[PDB]
Amino acid sequence: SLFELGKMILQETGKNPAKSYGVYGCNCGVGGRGKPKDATDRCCYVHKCCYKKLTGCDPKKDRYSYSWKDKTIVCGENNSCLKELCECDKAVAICLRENLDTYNKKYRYNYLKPACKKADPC
Amino acid sequence: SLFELGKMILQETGKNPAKSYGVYGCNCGVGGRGKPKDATDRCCYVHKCCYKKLTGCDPKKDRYSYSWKDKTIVCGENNSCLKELCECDKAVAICLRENLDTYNKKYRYNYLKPACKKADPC
Numbered sequence: 118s119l120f121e122l123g124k125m126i127l128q129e130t131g132k133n134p135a136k137s138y139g140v141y142g143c144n145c146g147v148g149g150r151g152k153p154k155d156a157t158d159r160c161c162y163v164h165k166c167c168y169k170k171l172t173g174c175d176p177k178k179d180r181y182s183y184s185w186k187d188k189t190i191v192c193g194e195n196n197s198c199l200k201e202l203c204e205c206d207k208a209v210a211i212c213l214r215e216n217l218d219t220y221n222k223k224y225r226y227n228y229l230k231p232a233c234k235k236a237d238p239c
Numbered sequence: 240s241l242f243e244l245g246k247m248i249l250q251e252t253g254k255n256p257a258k259s260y261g262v263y264g265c266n267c268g269v270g271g272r273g274k275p276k277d278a279t280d281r282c283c284y285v286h287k288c289c290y291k292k293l294t295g296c297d298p299k300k301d302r303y304s305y306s307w308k309d310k311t312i313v314c315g316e317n318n319s320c321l322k323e324l325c326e327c328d329k330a331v332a333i334c335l336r337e338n339l340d341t342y343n344k345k346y347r348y349n350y351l352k353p354a355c356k357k358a359d360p361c
């Protein structure tokens with residue numbers, strides 16, 4: 118769920134995830150996908166596509182379990198949808214950390230998300 | 240200060256630092272040093288020794304800056320005492336992570352700390 122996602126991001130990046138990503142770029146947080154603004158945004162794009170291929174569980178609502186093992190996110194549990202959901206979220210959190218070096222405060226409150234360029238199909 | 244310390248520990252271990260370590264073993268948390276019970280406890284011992292090297296800053300009260308970069312604690316700032324203090328704190332949070340594999344819940348609430356064998360000199 119949103120709660121696990123927000124936690125992973127906080128863990129990998131050290132940043133308040135809602136403040137740093139809740140309205141970041143064209144893909145991060147509220148809203149849909151759009152053409153990525155930068156590497157950070159592209160992480161979020163890839164993440165929302167990752168959600169699209171899931172069946173059998175609800176990405177936003179359904180909790181799943183994961184652990185923080187040697188400062189590594191490790192997804193927990195069998196149920197094929199929830200595992201894949203966890204892997205989606207993990208990959209985003211790592212991706213956001215890998216790309217903090219180009220994080221742009223400028224894109225942080227992108228209230229113009231409805232105006233992002235449409236995204237390619239996943 | 241205690242707040243930076245408890246934060247570094249949460250960050251490295253993912254564990255509630257007051258609950259996991261506030262009264263753990265003979266060295267962790269409240270009180271002085273004693274003979275370490277385990278690897279975890281040894282971390283805390285080394286840590287308290289580290290603080291004795293510090294002159295003219297107060298480890299419990301004095302705040303210092305540090306960052307979380309690439310899931311690494313990085314100590315911030317010049318003032319030779321605060322720097323050394325932060326490095327003490329970082330070393331212990333890594334140490335505790337490194338030793339989670341032998342963390343024992345049985346040592347967690349050691350109200351019996353005044354009965355710990357006396358520490359050797361640092």
Ligand SMILES: CCCCCCCCCCCCCCCCCC(=O)O
Pocket residue numbers: 121124127128129131182183184185249250251253254307
């Ligand atoms: C509900 C999912 C469980 C996830 C396991 C982690 C348990 C609680 C961990 C919370 C701290 C994460 C450590 C990473 C450090 C980020 C810095 C910070 O806490 O401000």
Ligand SMILES: CCCCCCCCCCCCCCCCCC(=O)O
Pocket residue numbers: 118119120122123124126134135138139144145146147161162164165177178209
């Ligand atoms: C579901 C119950 C509420 C849980 C509280 C969650 C609070 C944190 C949620 C906001 C996290 C920021 C989301 C950024 C996600 C970027 C990746 C993506 O948009 O696909």
Ligand SMILES: CCCCCCCCCCCCCCCCCC(=O)O
Pocket residue numbers: 240241242244245246248256257260261266267268269282283284286287299331
């Ligand atoms: C003093 C004002 C800060 C109040 C905020 C509370 C945060 C406290 C967390 C304390 C956790 C300490 C864990 C024990 C540290 C082990 C290392 C050692 O004992 O030398």
